[PDB]
Nucleic acid binder design. Structure first.
Ligand SMILES: [Mg+2]
Ligand SMILES: [Mg+2]
Ligand SMILES: [Mg+2]
Ligand SMILES: [Mg+2]
Ligand SMILES: [Mg+2]
Ligand SMILES: [Mg+2]
Ligand code: NA
Ligand code: NA
Lengths: 244, 244
RNA sequence: UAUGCAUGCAUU
RNA sequence: UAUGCAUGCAUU
């Protein structure tokens, strides 16, 4: 528990709505319209791991399409805010932004052309999830990838939703997450043939949904897309090393 | 690591106690077609710390039969004396298991198990006297040896021929015998459950026959690990976890 | 996010 | 025996 008081959450909603105006949810890069993403060379992944305050934020850059790690920054940080659903960015985003800036100063040539974020983008209680939030503050193209369904605007992990997951039969299969507004907030994606629990993909910034879904699918060796998976693995391994 | 002084004293103690091993049935329930009269099955296990070579947690459970509900638990932090050396497991875990037995007699003498499943081999052992025999001779309780991987002794090998046989195990309860180079039947490979492929290696501990030990092990398997051993392992690791 | 359980692989 | 990875479930 130890949730922030309502007055703090209310300020945070205001900041989310203001920055939401800067979200670009269409494609803005030439590689995004290419059938094989020709010209996409560098994909980023971000994640924060915790000690069972002390955390480890990690940014990786992977080559495309080989998905090999060409840059890694794993940093020990002291997080301030607690996890509250719908306010993830207020916990993780200042440190992720700080990693991007560190990359710009150390290997600016490895700046990623797109970033996969461990959390939703517009599939979010106010249409402005951590993936949008990182995208607006860095102006990088960002994809939101979530591991379970954020239940917003009528979306629910109920029987009907579970029935659709049964229709996902092969790697790459999708179905749209249709809000009560008639808006398509994201896609359920089956990562590969040997996984049944879908990923929940939504636009972060400067990318379209169908391109974000197709790209996430291409990063999936395992259920978790390789940029996120490598940041998660390396950040947790970094904690273990400086034993905790 | 122990000096050779201790090592030879250990080969000697094992041969000395081997003379008391009874590898036939001595309890009326063992001859019963449905094990009528068997009411209490024990399981023993010790968990270790990743950090401490010294600290360990030994646990003993007693389960009702045939419901397999835990009716007794004793979990104890202990100071290990010997390191793990293959073939001498008892000299590392068995003094603490004997102490758990003695404590049960003093606390709940009515829940004294009629048989004990041991996480480790019985007569399937470099000197025909594994930890399960060792506990059986020191307590005079009937004991079953259950191993999760094959102790390669007397020509037994986890080679291509052995792996073919494992493929021949098709359902829960399927078995094949483990024949040493002497032609002696040291144990049985048992498919524990329909939804596991990895066999158990079951051998006689004390005061039971192999056919009965195999059939009882199978009857205790909710999952791949027999429920008495499985419950001791879970409870002993949880105890280490909550003291870390 | 961390942890537990299940099934398998690897290391030991 | 502990850890890591994989797949699923649960708690959060
Ligand atoms: Mg994360
Ligand atoms: Mg993570
Ligand atoms: Mg054990
Ligand atoms: Mg164990
Ligand atoms: Mg995690
Ligand atoms: Mg273990
Ligand atoms: Na390319
Ligand atoms: Na009974």
């Amino acid at each position: 528990a130890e949730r922030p008081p309502e007055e703090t959450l209310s300020l945070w909603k205001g900041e989310q709505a203001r920055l939401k105006a800067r979200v670009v949810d269409r494609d803005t890069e030439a590689w995004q319209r290419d059938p094989s993403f020709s010209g996409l060379q560098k994909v980023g992944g971000v994640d924060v791991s915790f000690v069972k305050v002390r955390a480890c934020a990690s940014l990786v850059v992977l080559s495309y399409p080989e998905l090999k790690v060409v840059y890694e920054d794993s940093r020990m940080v002291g997080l301030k805010a607690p996890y509250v659903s719908g306010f993830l960015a207020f916990r993780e985003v200042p440190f992720l932004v700080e990693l991007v800036q560190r990359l710009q100063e150390k290997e600016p040539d490895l700046m990623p052309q797109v970033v996969l974020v461990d959390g939703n983008g517009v599939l979010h209680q106010r249409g402005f999830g951590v993936a949008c939030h990182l995208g607006v503050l860095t102006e990088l193209p960002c994809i939101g990838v979530a591991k379970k369904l954020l239940q917003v605007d009528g979306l629910e992990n109920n029987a009907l939703h579970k029935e659709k997951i049964v229709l996902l039969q092969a790697g790459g299969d999708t179905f749209p997450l249709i809000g009560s507004s008639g808006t398509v907030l994201g896609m359920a994606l089956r990562s590969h043939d040997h996984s049944t629990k879908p990923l929940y993909v939504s636009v972060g910034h400067r990318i379209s949904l169908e391109v974000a879904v197709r790209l996430t699918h291409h990063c999936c060796r395992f259920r978790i897309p390789e940029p996120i998976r490598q940041a998660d693995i390396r950040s947790r391994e970094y904690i273990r090393r400086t034993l905790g």
